[PDB]
Design a protein around this ligand. Structure first.
Ligand SMILES: [Fe+3]
Length: 186
């Protein structure tokens, strides 16, 4: 039974229930993420920014079956075009706006990766992607407002591929945590 999360802690508790089994009800998870009304005081601890690029801040390690983290995007910070390593990815805006650009998987042939579509993800909205849907880039295109997003990955993963927009060629990247549980982890 899906109830509105009252706080971030409540959301985390609910997520542990939703991931108690071996499969994932994407629509339910997305709905509960969307239903949590971002409260900055509840996640300030995790919102550790870097001047030069976006940061990944681990919030909860889940039950073995998911990673929950907060990404902090300075003005103009964005990601690579990337996949999600055969995992579910939920992305909920906690502050600001992010531009999500969707791309198809490239062919073997070297070619420009042409965007399929783009959209603006707004505060409190929750997006979803998986490799069956495609690839994406996520960007804070604002010149004046930092963005903060809450990402849930299931299963957890710490590597993915970045794709060269000019060719479709991919390279494996290991993701690093800027902090874990509020503690900076150099
Ligand atoms: Fe992503």
């Amino acid at each position: 039974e899906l109830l509105k999360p009252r706080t971030l802690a409540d959301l985390i508790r609910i997520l542990h229930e939703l991931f108690a089994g071996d499969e994932v009800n994407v629509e339910e998870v997305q709905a509960v993420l969307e239903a949590y009304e971002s409260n900055p005081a509840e996640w300030a601890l995790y919102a550790k920014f870097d001047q030069y690029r976006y940061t990944r801040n681990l919030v909860d390690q889940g039950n073995g079956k998911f990673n929950l983290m907060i990404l902090c995007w300075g003005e103009g910070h964005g990601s690579s075009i990337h996949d999600h390593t055969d995992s579910h990815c939920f992305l909920k805006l906690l502050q600001g706006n992010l531009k999500e650009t969707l791309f198809d998987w490239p062919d073997k042939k070297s070619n420009e990766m042409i965007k399929k579509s783009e959209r603006t993800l707004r505060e409190n909205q929750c997006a979803y992607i998986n490799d069956s849907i495609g690839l994406h880039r996520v960007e804070n295109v604002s010149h004046t407002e930092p963005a903060v997003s809450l990402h849930l990955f299931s299963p957890p993963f710490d590597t993915c591929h970045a794709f060269d927009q000019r060719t479709g060629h991919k390279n494996k990247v290991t993701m690093t945590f800027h902090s874990k549980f509020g503690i900076r982890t150099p």
